[model samples]
Target chain A: EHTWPDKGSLYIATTHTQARYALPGVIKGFIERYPRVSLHMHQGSPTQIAEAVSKGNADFAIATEALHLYDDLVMLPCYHWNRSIVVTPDHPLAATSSVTIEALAQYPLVTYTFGFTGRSELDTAFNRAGLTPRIVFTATDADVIKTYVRLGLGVGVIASMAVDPLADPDLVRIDAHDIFSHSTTKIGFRRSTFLRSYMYDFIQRFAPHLTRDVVDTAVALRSNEEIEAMFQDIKLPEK
Target chain B: EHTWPDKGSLYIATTHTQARYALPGVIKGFIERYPRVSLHMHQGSPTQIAEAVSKGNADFAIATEALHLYDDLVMLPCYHWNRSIVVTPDHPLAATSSVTIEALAQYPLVTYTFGFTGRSELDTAFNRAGLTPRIVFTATDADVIKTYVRLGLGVGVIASMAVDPLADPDLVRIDAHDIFSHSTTKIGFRRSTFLRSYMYDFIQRFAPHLTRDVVDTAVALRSNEEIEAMFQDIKLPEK
Candidate 1:
């Protein structure tokens, strides 16, 4: 029996953003709770992370993109984050209170690469408004997007959690929550794999919605679609 | 004959960074020189742009990525650009004049996505130094990278052309020319395609080295490798 005294290792696959900005605290807590366990982390693109989890190479996978595309992995909701518009201090858009998608289209835009961090939502919002925003540049990182914004390349749309007001005093961030649809990050693992007590505790700590019993029942289900339906009403916490 | 009097359209495929920041002047000049000629522009990933030119869907492809991978295309050197290190004013790295790869590895990093820019060079530089920088985020846009840098996600490495010393006064840009290998952006087109008179002029204007005779001789050749070897010693202008 692998108990608290026994040694085990947990392998995690994730994108650079989630591993750096989002999961640090959760990982620290997990390590503290299971002192005997060794943690191995691998960073990759969302699709690669999903593949790792699906192929049983990783014990856990977390990312905003591509995890949902995997049929072999079971996903549980983690948290919600929305895009924010970032501009230099004196930029014209900074003075505006509420910005619309149409208004945003008037200027050159810099945002995420497609399929990374809910870029689809940004696209869908503009497409629904019958506007084609000139995305002058796309990057997988929130920091790079903001860097160009600072250089007056264009206004930036990035995750809300990536913004640090005190650190970036020169930039003004206007909430785009009302403008773009929110994106949810999720924790995923193989559907048929048996999770240990520490693994269950790690999941619950990362996302309180996925208690041990709830995860056990979800994993026992046959279809990923049906498991998804069971958590349809669960709302993700705002960043 | 499709001469100056003939109504001709030119289709160009490029990345958004080049479209918005680099080629505006070149495009404006082309439009002014040939008011009757209609210009069609398509922006996409570097690989997609190369594919468009290779498939003969675009008359010209300009970007820093993937053009060399297409066997059907002819590539000519345009310009050279080096990366700059960006950090907020009070950032510790901002105070240092010369930064080594090992020093850079100590902090979280943000930079370009692989295959978008000369991200390969960035990787090569760190790898050669026997250091592994923790790249927390990657974006295709220079502006987006700057935005997150301002927000303190990490130190940013971006193209020199993307930085505007006046616009981003709050962010300190340390010259990374000495740190990483310089990247060259090139102009590409299908080898089987015929060039218009105005197209030759466009090439000359974009890169002074690509005169009418030079382009004519290069395109008359069969292989992209041969053309590349022909100009192996030619140096691109620094932006």
Candidate 2:
């Protein structure tokens, strides 16, 4: 048995949208339970967030990209978010019920910057299909991408969470539910770091399947392969 | 101009009483503001908590003991707490309005385990007076020490926060407000850490003067001596 701590500090690296939409409720809940523990937030692209965790700049990184490339991190899948092709209602792609990779390459892409929110997956889907997306404009802010699309800058491709139908009624979110390969957003920490009790509680709150026992089991393992095998059976909820 | 994060993690080291007594309101407020941040806690003796921050076990440690020994930490005084003595109504020391270190050594002592809750000060007071305390009972839980005192085990020396007059009307609290050397409990973190926004917020909430700017200035210093010189003018509140 372990003695639970009363106060401490933590730092996590993540992206703007994830911080905006997903974390507020959970962070509120955890801090409500453990008020004395100070929390720090570090925002960066997925690769950058991954590096922050891998290199000790941050204690954890909640991200979707470049997690597997890091040797020092043990990433636990937290949730799955679908990608969508966003455009203005008046745009040509709006008429299509669902989009194909070939149709996506017809226009310049206005999506997240490179190394962010399934951008690699977006590139991979097009690359494997023998087409190159004409990326004319990019922004880290999903809202910026949506605004540019409304201005007819290019087709907006972003995480579905940013597509608010009521707020942006003029934008069309064409389903690419299958064209882009599925990827998971994850909660990652350096494998060598010591996880505090609150760390276990927060991770469990963020991703319920990542229980304290499960994380402890994951931490003792020698490889990410072993950790993945341990987590393979648990079904992660779609965000 | 900085990108604010939406999600991350944190770890803090502290004691049960501080967690139970001082953190709830601030914790609620911070989590309410930044809900996506995850926090963790680690608890130990002053020496141990200091080590947790000095090494990599925890990102921060909030305690009153042995913090200066760790060259890796930057200690910021948060608040000062008064130490008190407790005894059953039937006990001899109950009649005393106030007691000096020499008078306290008359009976066997019942107090916190070594290195906890100003025990170092308690020892320092007695040793300087050329008296060795007969520590008949030792426990980390203040309530435990109170229970033993109620059973007439010995006099209870504990943090005044544990003494609820109505809850245990049967016990007498003898104030040693000036007998034991005063120490300021501090918020400590490793100098090497990249403090997140929430970390700054929590520190400020816990100790209002430790604003982001002040902490940033302290972080760039060469040693604790320089850090102390910078903080010497800031008045710490007595809790």
Candidate 3:
């Protein structure tokens, strides 16, 4: 059996969006629950995060892009999230209650850099609709996307949760749930690595449905296809 | 003597901010002045714009970054410009008349991507001050940076011309002249290419100081160092 007071460092690789906005609560909670465990975080683009986990530089990687491409990393669905449209208060799109992909395409656009966040999904939705978005600019951060949007460079596509109503009273935000495809953020770990009890506890806390037994079975499986099949019935909670 | 009613095309590569905000007036004037010359514009990051001009895909490239890095192109000063600080109306920084680099670095920051605009200069000012900025996000367009600033992602650093006071009534803009170094936007062309009369006229119209005679002498010079010495005394108009 593992000791009650475990002291070890847990390294996590994540993108700017996740590092700054998404994981703060979970990290705070994790630290509070396990006072003896130290956390070390590395921030980078999605590809870098995947590479970190694959190379064993980080114990865990969480990002919205490129994780599935790594064959050596075990991946599990964490949550379902959608993007939102942000604009200045005076922008014409602000008057619309619901925005369509077609209407959004008419204006210049700014969004995440390719392969960062769920940029591919954003592209797929527009391309599938037979519309070519006039993307004037691309950035790795939601804050960057928002900055260009305010300058009238174009409308911005950013994560819904990144917007704070109180903080951005001057900006208007509209849900893009009906327009853009929903994206899934995944957690990754090296397939061959052994997980300690705290790692399992951290996973359960990050995503409640990812219990220790479920993660153990998935990790023990030899192939990604088998691991995917094992958790096929588990549903991701919508954020 | 060049022929009148020239039906040839002119391809210009520039950044999104310059393409959207700065060049529109100049381009409109050029088209009106030379109705027969077809204009084709390509928008990209600063590095891409420089590459396009160097590779002969574009007749001219205008940007604030990376143009000097290309040895094959002859560059001339276009204008001198500065950045501005953008924040939400009630943001504490907005209350200040002017901001210092150190004061600006105290909060989360969002600005242009490296080599896209004057990102290097922004970095230099902070590095010189011995204060590492908390650049939470970065983008290729100023508009994207403004959107995040509105959401309280952080204060935004953007080109002064990109901010439209009437349009962005909810955000406060402070001059960053004292905080950051000034930037120079330049127009570049291949040294080996022969300039058309319309091209000379366009250059003169864009930057009045680059008179046809001045451009002729600079183009005829064999080395960039000689050309630099040729117009060393010419001053760029502040925007």
lDDT of each: 0.76, 0.72, 0.74
The order by descending DockQ is 1, 3, 2
lDDT of 1: 0.76
DockQ scores of all models, one per candidate: 0.07, 0.01, 0.07
Model 1 per-residue lDDT at B138: 65
Location of the lowest summed lDDT over 10 successive residues in candidate 2 chain A = A136-145
For residues B1-239, write the lDDT of model 2, one tens digit per residue: 23345587666767645654565466556555765665444344566567667765577787764653566678777887878889877676776655667878988787765566678888888888999897755555565566556655568888887688887787888878888877677787876788888889889999888899988887777566686677677667776
Interface RMSD per candidate: 8.1, 21.8, 7.9
Which regions of candidate 3 deviate over 4 angstroms?
A: A1-239, B1-5, B28-40, B225-234
Q: Candidate 1 residues B53-172, lDDT tens each?
A: 876467898887465456677888788888889999888888777787778888878787657577888888989999887766665566656756665567898888888989787889
TM-score of each: 0.62, 0.49, 0.59
RMSD of model 1 against the true structure: 7.9
DockQ of 3: 0.07
Question: How much lDDT does candidate 2 score?
Answer: 0.72
By TM-score, the better pick of 1 and 2 is: 1
User: What is the number of backbone collisions in each predicted candidate, taken in the order shown?
Assistant: 25, 16, 14
The segments of candidate 2 whose C-alpha lies over 4 angstroms from its true place after superposition are A1-5, B1-239
**What is the descending lDDT order?**
1, 3, 2
